[PDB]
Symmetry: C2
Subunit: 237 residues, 2 copies
């Protein structure tokens, strides 16, 4: 009711139609009334991303590598990538007509072309034919967060390998082109993996990459197999 009274001063309220999470901003959240005001203007802020909520918006000061920012590039679709200043200006204007627009707060780097790719009927790793991958347990950020980002972007199976207990038999193939795909952190995990695979499956193909290969692929919503950047080893026909 207290938000309703504040908004009563207005002859007509915009419906911004945003379903958003915030990352790299609003770390302590919003007070009960601001949430109510925002809701009344068709803006719902969620704490976590649930595929259920059909999120369409991300608030962030810039392109970030957080789980949330990367995951927003798998929204279905992402419609708005907005700087926090949008909410700030909007709440400011409201707390004493409403004309804050959705166009003057775009995040540098996230443009029409990238955003529209979130409308594709496939995910980035899905159209790259990277379905089942191996991840070394010493991935910075832990394996659950990385795993969940990758699954959001179309990877079907995330197989965690522990360096350095893992054998060839723990490596899973990429059944959907590369038979083995691995994400590794230390450039000496490469040697061990290429030896194991070369010994047991000599003629098969292998792709070994750093987490930043995944990151850049998500940022572009495209796996560029042409790039050598963040590729630690590849064996193809």
């Amino acid at each position: 009711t207290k938000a309703e009274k504040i908004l009563a001063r207005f002859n007509e309220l915009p419906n911004y139609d945003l379903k958003a999470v915030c990352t790299g901003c609003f770390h302590d959240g919003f007070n009960e009334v601001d949430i109510e005001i925002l809701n009344q203007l068709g803006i719902k802020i969620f704490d976590n991303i649930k595929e259920t909520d059909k999120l369409n918006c991300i608030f962030a000061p810039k392109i970030l590598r957080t789980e949330k920012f990367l995951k927003s590039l798998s929204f279905e679709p992402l419609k708005f990538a907005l700087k926090p200043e949008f909410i700030i200006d909007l709440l400011k204007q409201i707390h004493s007509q409403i004309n804050i627009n959705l166009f003057d707060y775009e995040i540098n780097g996230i443009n029409e072309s990238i955003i529209s790719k979130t409308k594709l009927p496939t995910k980035v790793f899905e159209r790259a034919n990277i379905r089942c991958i191996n991840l070394v347990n010493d991935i910075p950020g832990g394996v659950d967060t990385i795993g969940s980002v990758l699954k959001a972007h179309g990877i079907e199976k995330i197989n965690v390998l522990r360096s350095k207990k893992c054998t060839f038999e723990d490596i899973i193939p990429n059944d959907v082109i590369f038979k083995y795909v691995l994400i590794v952190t230390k450039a000496s995990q490469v040697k061990k993996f290429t030896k194991l695979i070369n010994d047991r499956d000599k003629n098969e193909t292998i792709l070994i990459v750093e987490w930043n290969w995944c990151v850049e692929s998500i940022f572009h919503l495209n796996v560029d197999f042409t790039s050598k950047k963040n590729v630690l080893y590849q064996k193809k026909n």
Copy 2:
């Protein structure tokens, strides 16, 4: 070995006597020869922190909030906080006498006074009488990494609270001053905890803080109970 041949060119080798981890630098690591080179020079680089390794050194470009940086402030003791350029200049000098010193590469804000506090026979939260704390699981970084930092710094028991599945009975007291200590992320969570506790234990003391309160206490190796910075609520008698 290859490392030995390279080092044979020197008529005397320093023993730097470092046992270190790196954070915010050398993300891919070192090749097999460099590791052996540094080793011959009394510099051991570890991947993760194990209390048994008795680390005495952190390599980092500046003061950081990573798990490794914060934990280096509980080494026993921390002897050197060094910029990665120390390793870079050392390796460069070696690959073509050895005179790179440990004094010209200190990290800013780190300090002989802070560094020497790591020799104390207590940990920072231990002398602050914060033994048992409650952590809300929506903390950015996950609880087990937050928990690991705090245990390293003398907190005996990290109790994880689920907002909003948690109840008064899930809250554990600080039995070693404040009977209840909570770390909370969302400002709107404070209301809920203080209501629960006030209803059930009206006369007892309560301290509720943001994660940055812990971080700064670690950075200073002191809990300043005089500070209102990052304190969300406190009830004292």
